[PDB]
XYZ file of C-alpha atoms in Angstrom:
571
model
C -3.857 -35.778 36.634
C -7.049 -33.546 37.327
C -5.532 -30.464 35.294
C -8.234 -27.920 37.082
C -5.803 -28.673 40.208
C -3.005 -27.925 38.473
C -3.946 -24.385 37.329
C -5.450 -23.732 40.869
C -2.192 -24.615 42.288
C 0.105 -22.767 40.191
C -1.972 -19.898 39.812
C -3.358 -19.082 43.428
C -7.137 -19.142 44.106
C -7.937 -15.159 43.517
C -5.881 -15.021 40.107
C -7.576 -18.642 39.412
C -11.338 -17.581 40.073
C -10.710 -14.059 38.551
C -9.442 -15.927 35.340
C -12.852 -18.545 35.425
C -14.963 -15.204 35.859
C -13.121 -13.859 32.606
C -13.880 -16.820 30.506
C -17.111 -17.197 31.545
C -17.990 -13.498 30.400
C -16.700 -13.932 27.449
C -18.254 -17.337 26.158
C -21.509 -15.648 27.197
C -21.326 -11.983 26.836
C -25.717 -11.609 27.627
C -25.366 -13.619 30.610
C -25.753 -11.429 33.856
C -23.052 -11.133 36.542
C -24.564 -12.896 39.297
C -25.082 -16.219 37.291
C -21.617 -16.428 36.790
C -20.047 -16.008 39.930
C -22.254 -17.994 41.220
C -20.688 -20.716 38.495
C -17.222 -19.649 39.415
C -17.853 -20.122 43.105
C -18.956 -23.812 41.944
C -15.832 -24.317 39.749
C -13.491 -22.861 42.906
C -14.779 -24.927 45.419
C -15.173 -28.407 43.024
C -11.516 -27.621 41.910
C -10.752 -27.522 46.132
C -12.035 -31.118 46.107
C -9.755 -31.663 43.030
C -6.428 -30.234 44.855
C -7.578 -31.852 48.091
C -7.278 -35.236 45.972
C -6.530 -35.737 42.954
C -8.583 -39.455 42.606
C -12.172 -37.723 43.448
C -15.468 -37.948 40.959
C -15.032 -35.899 38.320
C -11.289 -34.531 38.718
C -9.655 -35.864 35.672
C -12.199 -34.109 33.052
C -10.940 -31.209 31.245
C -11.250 -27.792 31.937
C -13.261 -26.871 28.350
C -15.956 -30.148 29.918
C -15.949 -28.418 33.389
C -16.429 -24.838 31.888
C -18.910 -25.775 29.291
C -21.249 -27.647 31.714
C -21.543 -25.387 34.027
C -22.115 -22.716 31.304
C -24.553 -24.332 30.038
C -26.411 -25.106 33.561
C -27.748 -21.952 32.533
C -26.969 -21.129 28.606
C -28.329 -18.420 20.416
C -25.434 -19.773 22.234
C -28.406 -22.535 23.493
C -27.232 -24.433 19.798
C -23.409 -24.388 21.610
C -24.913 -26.405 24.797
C -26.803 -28.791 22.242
C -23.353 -29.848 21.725
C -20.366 -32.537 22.594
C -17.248 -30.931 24.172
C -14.888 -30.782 21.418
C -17.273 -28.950 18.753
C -19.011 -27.203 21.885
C -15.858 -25.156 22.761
C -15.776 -24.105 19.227
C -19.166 -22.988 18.836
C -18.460 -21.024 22.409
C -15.455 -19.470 20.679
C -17.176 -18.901 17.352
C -20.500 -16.708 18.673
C -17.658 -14.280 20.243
C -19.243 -10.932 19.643
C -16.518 -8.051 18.632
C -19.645 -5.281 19.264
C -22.115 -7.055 21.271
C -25.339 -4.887 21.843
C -24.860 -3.840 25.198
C -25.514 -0.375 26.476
C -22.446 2.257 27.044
C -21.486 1.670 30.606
C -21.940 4.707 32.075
C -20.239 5.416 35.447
C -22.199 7.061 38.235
C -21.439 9.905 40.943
C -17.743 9.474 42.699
C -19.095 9.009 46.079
C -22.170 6.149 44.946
C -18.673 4.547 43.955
C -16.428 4.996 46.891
C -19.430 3.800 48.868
C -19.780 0.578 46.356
C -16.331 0.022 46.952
C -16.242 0.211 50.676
C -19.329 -1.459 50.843
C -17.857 -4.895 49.045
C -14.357 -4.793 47.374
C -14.658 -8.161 46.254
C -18.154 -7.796 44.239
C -16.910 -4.605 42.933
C -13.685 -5.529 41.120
C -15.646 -8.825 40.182
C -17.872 -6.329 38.680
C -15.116 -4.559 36.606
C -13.615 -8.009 35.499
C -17.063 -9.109 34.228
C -17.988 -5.935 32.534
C -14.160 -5.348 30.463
C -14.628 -9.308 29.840
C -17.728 -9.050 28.551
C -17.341 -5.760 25.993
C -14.015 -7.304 25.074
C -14.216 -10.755 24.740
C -10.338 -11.384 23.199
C -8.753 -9.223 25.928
C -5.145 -10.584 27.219
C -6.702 -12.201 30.356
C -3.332 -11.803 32.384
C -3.385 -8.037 31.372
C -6.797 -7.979 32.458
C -5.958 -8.902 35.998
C -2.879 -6.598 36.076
C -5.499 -3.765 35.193
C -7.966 -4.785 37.670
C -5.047 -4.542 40.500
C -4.456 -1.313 38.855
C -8.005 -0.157 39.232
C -8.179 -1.276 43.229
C -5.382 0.290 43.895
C -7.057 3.182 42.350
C -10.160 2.954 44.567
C -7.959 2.300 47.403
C -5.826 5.419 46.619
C -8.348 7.861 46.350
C -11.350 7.084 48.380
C -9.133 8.523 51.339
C -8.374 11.776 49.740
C -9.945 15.007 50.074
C -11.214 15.557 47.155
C -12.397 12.282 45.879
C -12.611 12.772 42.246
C -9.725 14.907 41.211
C -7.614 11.641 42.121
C -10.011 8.949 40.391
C -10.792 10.148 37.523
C -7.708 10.641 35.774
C -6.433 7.196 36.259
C -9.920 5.533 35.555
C -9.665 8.005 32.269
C -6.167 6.331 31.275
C -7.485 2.950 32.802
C -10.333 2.964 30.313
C -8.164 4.242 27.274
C -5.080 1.718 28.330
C -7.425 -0.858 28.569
C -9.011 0.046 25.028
C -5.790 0.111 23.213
C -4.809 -3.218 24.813
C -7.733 -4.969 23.807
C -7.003 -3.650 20.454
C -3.446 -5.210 19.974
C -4.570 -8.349 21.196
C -7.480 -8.800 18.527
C -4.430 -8.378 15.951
C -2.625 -11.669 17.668
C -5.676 -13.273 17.718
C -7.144 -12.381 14.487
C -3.205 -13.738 12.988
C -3.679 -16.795 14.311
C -6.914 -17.420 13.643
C -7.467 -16.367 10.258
C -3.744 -16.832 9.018
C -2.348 -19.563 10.847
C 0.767 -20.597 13.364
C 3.085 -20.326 10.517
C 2.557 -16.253 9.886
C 2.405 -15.877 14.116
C 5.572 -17.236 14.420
C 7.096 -14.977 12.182
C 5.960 -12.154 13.190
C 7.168 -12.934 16.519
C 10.389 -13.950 15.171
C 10.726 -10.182 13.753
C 9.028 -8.550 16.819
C 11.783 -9.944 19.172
C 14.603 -10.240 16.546
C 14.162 -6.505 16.936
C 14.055 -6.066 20.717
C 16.483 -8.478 21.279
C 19.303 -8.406 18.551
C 22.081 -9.578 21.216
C 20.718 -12.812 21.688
C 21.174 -15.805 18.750
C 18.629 -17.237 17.048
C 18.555 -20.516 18.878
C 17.697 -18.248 21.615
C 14.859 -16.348 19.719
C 13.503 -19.582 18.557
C 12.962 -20.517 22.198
C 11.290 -17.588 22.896
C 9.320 -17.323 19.887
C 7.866 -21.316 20.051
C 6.696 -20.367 24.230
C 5.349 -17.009 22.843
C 3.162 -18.436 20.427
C 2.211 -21.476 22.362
C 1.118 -18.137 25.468
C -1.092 -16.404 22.592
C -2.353 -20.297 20.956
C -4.256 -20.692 24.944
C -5.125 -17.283 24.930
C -6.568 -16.722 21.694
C -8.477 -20.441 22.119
C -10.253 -19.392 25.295
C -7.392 -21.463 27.993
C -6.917 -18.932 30.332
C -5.921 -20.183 32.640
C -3.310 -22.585 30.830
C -2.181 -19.232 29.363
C -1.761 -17.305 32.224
C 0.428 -19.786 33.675
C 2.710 -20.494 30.631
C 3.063 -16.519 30.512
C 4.322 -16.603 33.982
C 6.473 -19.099 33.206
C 7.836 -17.578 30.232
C 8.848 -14.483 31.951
C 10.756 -16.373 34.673
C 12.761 -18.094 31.833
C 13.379 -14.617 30.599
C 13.949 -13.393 33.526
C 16.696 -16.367 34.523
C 18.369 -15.643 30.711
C 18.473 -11.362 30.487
C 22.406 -12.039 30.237
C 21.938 -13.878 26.512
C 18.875 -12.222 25.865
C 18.389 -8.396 26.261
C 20.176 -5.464 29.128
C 17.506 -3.832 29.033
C 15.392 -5.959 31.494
C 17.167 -5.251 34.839
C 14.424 -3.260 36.049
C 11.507 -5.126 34.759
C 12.778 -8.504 36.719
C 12.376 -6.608 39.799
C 9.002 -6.552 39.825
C 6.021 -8.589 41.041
C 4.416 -11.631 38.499
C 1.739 -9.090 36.527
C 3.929 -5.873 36.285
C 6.904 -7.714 34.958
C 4.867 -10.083 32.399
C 3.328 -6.380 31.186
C 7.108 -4.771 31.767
C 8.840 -7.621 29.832
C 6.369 -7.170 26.894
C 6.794 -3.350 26.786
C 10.443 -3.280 26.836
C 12.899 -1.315 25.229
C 14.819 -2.715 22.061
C 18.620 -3.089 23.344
C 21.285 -1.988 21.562
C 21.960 -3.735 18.348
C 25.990 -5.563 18.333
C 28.525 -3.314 17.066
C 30.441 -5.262 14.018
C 27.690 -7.134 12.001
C 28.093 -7.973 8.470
C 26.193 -6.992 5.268
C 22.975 -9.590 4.883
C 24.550 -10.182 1.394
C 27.384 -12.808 1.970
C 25.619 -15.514 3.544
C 22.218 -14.548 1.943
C 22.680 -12.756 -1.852
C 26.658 -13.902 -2.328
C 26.841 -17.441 -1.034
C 27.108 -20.131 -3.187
C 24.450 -22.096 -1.127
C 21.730 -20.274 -0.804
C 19.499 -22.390 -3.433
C 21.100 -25.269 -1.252
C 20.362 -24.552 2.045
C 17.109 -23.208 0.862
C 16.304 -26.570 -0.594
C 17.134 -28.560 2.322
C 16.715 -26.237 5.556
C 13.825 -23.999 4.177
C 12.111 -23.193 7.227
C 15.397 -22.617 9.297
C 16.555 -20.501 6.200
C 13.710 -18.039 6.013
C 13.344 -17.299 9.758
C 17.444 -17.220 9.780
C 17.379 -14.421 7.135
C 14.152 -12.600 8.870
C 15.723 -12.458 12.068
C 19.390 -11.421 10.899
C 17.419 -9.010 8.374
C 15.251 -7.862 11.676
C 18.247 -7.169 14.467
C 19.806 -4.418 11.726
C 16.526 -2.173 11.175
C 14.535 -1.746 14.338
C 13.953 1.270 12.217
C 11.378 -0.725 9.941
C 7.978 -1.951 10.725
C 6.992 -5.425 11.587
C 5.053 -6.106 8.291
C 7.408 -4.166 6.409
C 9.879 -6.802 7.583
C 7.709 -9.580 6.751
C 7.012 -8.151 3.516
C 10.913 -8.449 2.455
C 11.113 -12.076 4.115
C 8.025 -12.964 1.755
C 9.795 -11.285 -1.279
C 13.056 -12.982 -0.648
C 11.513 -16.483 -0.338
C 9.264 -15.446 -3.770
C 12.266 -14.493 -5.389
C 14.119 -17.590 -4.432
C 11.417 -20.175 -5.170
C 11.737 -18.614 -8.601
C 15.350 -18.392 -9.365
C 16.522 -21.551 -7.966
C 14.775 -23.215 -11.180
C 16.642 -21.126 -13.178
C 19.407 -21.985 -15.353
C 22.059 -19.253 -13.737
C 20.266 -18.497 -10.507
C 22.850 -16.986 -8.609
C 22.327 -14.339 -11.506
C 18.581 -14.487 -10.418
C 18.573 -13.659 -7.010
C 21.976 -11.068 -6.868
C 19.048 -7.815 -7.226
C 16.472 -9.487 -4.569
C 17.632 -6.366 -2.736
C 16.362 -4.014 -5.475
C 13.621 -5.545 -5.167
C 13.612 -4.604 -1.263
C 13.860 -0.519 -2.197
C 10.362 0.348 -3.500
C 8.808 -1.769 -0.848
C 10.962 -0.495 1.677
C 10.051 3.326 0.615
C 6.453 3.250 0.256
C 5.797 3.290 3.785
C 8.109 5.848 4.412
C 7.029 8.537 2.076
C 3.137 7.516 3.300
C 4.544 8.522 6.774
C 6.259 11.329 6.099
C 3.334 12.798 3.759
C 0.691 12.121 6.601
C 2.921 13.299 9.713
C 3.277 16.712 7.628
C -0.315 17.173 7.432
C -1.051 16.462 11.131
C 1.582 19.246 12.087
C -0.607 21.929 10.427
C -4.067 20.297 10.885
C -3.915 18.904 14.809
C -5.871 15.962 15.586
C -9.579 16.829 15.009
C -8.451 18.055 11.802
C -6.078 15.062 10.898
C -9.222 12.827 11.917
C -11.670 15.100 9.985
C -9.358 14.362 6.903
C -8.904 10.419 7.402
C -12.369 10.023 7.412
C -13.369 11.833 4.749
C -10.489 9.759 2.521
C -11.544 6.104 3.794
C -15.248 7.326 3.430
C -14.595 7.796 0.275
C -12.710 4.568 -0.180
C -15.254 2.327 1.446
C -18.506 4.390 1.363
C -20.318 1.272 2.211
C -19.138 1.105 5.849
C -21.707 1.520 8.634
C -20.976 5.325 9.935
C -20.138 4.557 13.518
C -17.169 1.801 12.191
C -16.106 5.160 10.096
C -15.847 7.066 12.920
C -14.094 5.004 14.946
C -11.446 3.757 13.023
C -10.881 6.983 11.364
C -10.517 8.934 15.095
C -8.206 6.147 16.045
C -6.647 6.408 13.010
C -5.703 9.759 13.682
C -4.657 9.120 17.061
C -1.577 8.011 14.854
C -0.186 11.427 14.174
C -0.585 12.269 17.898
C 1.485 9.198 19.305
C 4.110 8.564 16.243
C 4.696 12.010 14.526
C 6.564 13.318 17.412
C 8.912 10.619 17.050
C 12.431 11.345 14.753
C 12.721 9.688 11.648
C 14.730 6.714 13.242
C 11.151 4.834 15.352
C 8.372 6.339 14.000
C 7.909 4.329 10.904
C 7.065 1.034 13.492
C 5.135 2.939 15.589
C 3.184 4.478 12.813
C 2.680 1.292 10.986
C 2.204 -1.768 13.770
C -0.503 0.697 14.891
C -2.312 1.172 11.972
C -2.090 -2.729 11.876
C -3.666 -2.691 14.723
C -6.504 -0.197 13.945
C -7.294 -1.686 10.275
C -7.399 -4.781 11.989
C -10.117 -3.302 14.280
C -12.197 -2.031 11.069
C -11.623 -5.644 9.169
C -13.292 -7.803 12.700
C -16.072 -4.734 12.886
C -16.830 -5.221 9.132
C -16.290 -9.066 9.087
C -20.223 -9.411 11.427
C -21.973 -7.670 8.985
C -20.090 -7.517 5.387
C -21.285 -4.295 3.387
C -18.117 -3.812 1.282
C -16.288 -5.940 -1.123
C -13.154 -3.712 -0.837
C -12.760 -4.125 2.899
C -13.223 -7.834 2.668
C -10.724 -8.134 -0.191
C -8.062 -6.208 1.657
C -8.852 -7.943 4.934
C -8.671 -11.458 3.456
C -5.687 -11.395 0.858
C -2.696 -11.022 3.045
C -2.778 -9.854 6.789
C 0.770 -7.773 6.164
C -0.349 -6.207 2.927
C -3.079 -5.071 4.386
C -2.124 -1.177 4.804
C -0.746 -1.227 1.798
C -3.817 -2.229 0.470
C -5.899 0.070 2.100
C -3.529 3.141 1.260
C -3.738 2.331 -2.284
C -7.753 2.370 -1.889
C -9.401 5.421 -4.427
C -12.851 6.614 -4.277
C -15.508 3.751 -5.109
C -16.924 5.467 -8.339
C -19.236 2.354 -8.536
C -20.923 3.045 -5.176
C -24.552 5.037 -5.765
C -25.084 7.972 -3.479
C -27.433 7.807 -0.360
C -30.352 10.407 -0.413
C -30.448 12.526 2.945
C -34.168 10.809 4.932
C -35.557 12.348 8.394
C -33.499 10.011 10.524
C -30.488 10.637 8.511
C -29.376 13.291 11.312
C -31.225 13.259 14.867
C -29.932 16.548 16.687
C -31.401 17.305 19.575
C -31.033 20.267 22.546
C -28.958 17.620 24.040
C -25.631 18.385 21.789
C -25.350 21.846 23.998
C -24.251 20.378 27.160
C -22.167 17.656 25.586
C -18.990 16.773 26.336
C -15.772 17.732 23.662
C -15.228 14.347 22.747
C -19.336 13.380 22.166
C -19.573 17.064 20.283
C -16.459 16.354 18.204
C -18.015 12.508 17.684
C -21.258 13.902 16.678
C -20.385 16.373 14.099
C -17.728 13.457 12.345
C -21.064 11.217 12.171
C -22.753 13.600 10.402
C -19.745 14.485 7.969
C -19.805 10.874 6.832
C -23.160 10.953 6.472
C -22.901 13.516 3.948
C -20.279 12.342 2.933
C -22.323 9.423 1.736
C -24.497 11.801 -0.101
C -21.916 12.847 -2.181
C -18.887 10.949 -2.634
C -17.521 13.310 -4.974
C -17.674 17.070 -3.509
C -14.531 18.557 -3.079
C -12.948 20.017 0.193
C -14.490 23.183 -0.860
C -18.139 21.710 -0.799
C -17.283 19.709 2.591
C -16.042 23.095 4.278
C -19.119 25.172 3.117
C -21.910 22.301 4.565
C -19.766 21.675 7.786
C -19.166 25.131 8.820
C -23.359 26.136 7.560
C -24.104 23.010 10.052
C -21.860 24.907 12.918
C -23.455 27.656 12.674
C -27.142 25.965 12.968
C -25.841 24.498 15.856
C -24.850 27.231 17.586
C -27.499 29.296 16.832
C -30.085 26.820 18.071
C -27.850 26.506 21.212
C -28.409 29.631 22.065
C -32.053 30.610 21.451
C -34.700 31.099 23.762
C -36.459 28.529 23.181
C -35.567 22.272 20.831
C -37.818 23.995 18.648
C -35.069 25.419 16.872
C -33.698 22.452 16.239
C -36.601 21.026 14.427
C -37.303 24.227 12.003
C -33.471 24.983 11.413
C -32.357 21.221 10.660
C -35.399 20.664 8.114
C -34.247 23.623 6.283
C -30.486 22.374 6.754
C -31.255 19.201 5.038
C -33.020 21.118 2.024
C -30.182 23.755 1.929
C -27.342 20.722 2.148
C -29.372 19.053 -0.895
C -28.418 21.926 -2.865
C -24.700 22.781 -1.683
């Protein structure tokens, strides 16, 4: 009885009202921050009634009733609060905006912060809950309160120090991009679930741990696997609070088990409740068991594979992904699933067959070209970011999915493609052995980021295709992209490039950000010039640039980029 008391009790009240103030910003991502603590202070002190007794008014209701009534005590999203509970919820979780139009949250002067800080700690990491929440409304909400102790303890660290700054901003800086890449992986979880169902969650989950855990049976894995998804179920379904809990709980079970599970997680069981959640899910694959036999006896040789296929289908398939998973943490995730999906194809179709164990012997020939595609697309890209470097390597991404989905919107380009790049940077430096999952779980992860951008506002059959068809093809599909010869090229307008005396004193990243926006928008213009072409117009437009820069007089900028567009018309 009266669940709200349960989650208060096993939670704690500051973790509790931290986790209410992240699911209220993001059901309503417009709504401004003192309206909702002001509804979490309501929630916190009703659900004090609640664990004071259990038998009082309104206990027994359930947290989406609670949630959504106070919401809407002040609540487009006014359709939502128009609405009965169980189809309210939904339309709450449905209006979830992946780019909401909210301004870049620009952070003022070090000491207006230290003095915020000092001032009210409270308010001010409420603040930094409700702001994250509401710019990333499928963030891990258990991560998010591990990064707002992170961010305190920043504040706390360095608003003693001498020199303020040269201690905050660095770890705000890795804060902000931690906290960006996080959100990032958990859209992927969410967006699997969502789109693609339990089934496809569960085994990628069974190949995720299969890999990080290869000591421990499948029985074991199973376990883990079934709490795992039910963890990212609440979480991707807006339970927070149910999630946060189940997490907790499913790192004390691991925690209880690292004998049959993994030796690698000594030193993450140390640690306190957030840390070791974030530890366990960060660890280390252990080493694989010494004397395991070829995946061919039991799966390619046996004499019962059509049997046991017929009868235990399920417990087959996830059997032969998880054995086929322990042996090569050297393979991606999808590239995994892939070969479980080809092996059940292949099966479904030779155990009609008239000699079938002579149909399925060469299911691993089959495996080869699938399993070298990737690695080939790896190696070819990781040997052009050694002799390009990032900018370049990003430069060169965006040009080739420019020219494979011209009709994206120019800032999704640039994004995606700069994160794309960001691949050769944190995977190339790896040996052969790990960098093919690093390389291709994170491109998962950043195609996954351009398929939710493009799914709001649809320009591009391609991308919807590839996003839609199957969620582990998906690179594939986008690597195999070639320039859209049916697309018609964009004339150059005045508001096609809007540079202003304000590019001088800009930062690296904003100059390097401003110059790839206006490389796809030429880009655009022509689909078809060659490097050659590109290299001529880019390095014309650096010169403008820096001419205007440095001339004694925006005036420049006016004359100089009217005769730039009439000079780029022609070249």
């Amino acid at each position: 009885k009266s669940e709200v008391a349960h989650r208060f009790k096993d939670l704690g009240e500051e973790n509790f009202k931290a986790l209410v103030l992240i699911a209220f910003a993001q059901y309503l991502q417009q709504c401004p921050f003192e309206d909702h603590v002001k509804l979490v202070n309501e929630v916190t002190e009703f659900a004090k009634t609640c664990v004071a007794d259990e038998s009082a008014e309104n206990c027994d209701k359930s947290l989406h009733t609670l949630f959504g009534d106070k919401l809407c005590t002040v609540a487009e999203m006014a359709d939502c609060c128009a609405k009965q509970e169980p189809e309210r919820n939904e339309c709450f979780l449905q209006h979830k905006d992946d780019n909401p139009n909210l301004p870049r949250l620009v952070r003022p002067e070090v000491d207006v912060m230290c003095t915020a800080f000092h001032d009210n700690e409270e308010t001010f990491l409420k603040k930094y809950l409700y702001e994250i929440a509401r710019r990333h409304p499928y963030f891990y909400a258990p991560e998010l309160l591990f990064f707002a102790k992170r961010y305190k303890a920043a504040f706390t660290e360095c608003c003693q120090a001498a020199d303020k700054a040269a201690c905050l901003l660095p770890k705000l800086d890795e804060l902000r991009d931690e906290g960006k890449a996080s959100s990032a992986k958990q859209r992927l979880k969410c967006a699997s679930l969502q789109k693609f169902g339990e089934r496809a969650f569960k085994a990628w989950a069974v190949a995720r741990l299969s890999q990080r855990f290869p000591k421990a049976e499948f029985a074991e894995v199973s376990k883990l696997v079934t709490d795992l998804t039910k963890v990212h179920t609440e979480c991707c379904h807006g339970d927070l609070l149910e999630c946060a809990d189940d997490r907790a709980d499913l790192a004390k079970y691991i925690c209880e088990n690292q004998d049959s599970i993994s030796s690698k997680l000594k030193e993450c069981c140390e640690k306190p409740l957030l840390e070791k959640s974030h530890c366990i899910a960060e660890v280390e694959n252990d080493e694989m068991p010494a004397d395991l036999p070829s995946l061919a006896a039991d799966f390619v040789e046996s004499k019962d594979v059509c049997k046991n296929y017929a009868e235990a289908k399920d417990v087959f398939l996830g059997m032969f992904l998880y054995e086929y998973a322990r042996r090569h943490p050297d393979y991606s995730v999808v590239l995994l699933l892939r070969l479980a999906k080809t092996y059940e194809t292949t099966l479904e179709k030779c155990c009609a067959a008239a000699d079938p164990h002579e149909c399925y012997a060469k299911v691993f020939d089959e495996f080869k070209p699938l399993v070298e595609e990737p690695q080939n697309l790896i190696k070819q890209n990781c040997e052009l970011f050694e002799q390009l470097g990032e900018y370049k390597f990003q430069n060169a991404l965006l040009v080739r999915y420019t020219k494979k989905v011209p009709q994206v919107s120019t800032p999704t380009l640039v994004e995606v493609s700069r994160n794309l790049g960001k691949v050769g940077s944190k995977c190339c430096k790896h040996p052969e052995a790990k960098r093919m999952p690093c390389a291709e779980d994170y491109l998962s992860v950043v195609l996954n980021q351009l398929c939710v951008l493009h799914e709001k506002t649809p320009v591009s059959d391609r991308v919807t295709k590839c996003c839609t068809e199957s969620l582990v093809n998906r690179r594939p599909c986008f690597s195999a992209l070639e320039v859209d010869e049916t697309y018609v090229p964009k004339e150059f307008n005045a508001e096609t490039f809007t540079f202003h005396a304000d590019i001088c004193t800009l930062s690296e990243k904003e100059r390097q950000i401003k110059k790839q926006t206006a490389l796809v928008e030429l880009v655009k213009h022509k689909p078809k010039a060659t490097k050659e072409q590109l290299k001529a117009v880019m390095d014309d437009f650096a010169a403008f640039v820096e001419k205007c820069c440095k001339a004694d007089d925006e005036t420049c900028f006016a004359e100089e980029g009217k005769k730039l567009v009439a000079a780029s018309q022609a070249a």
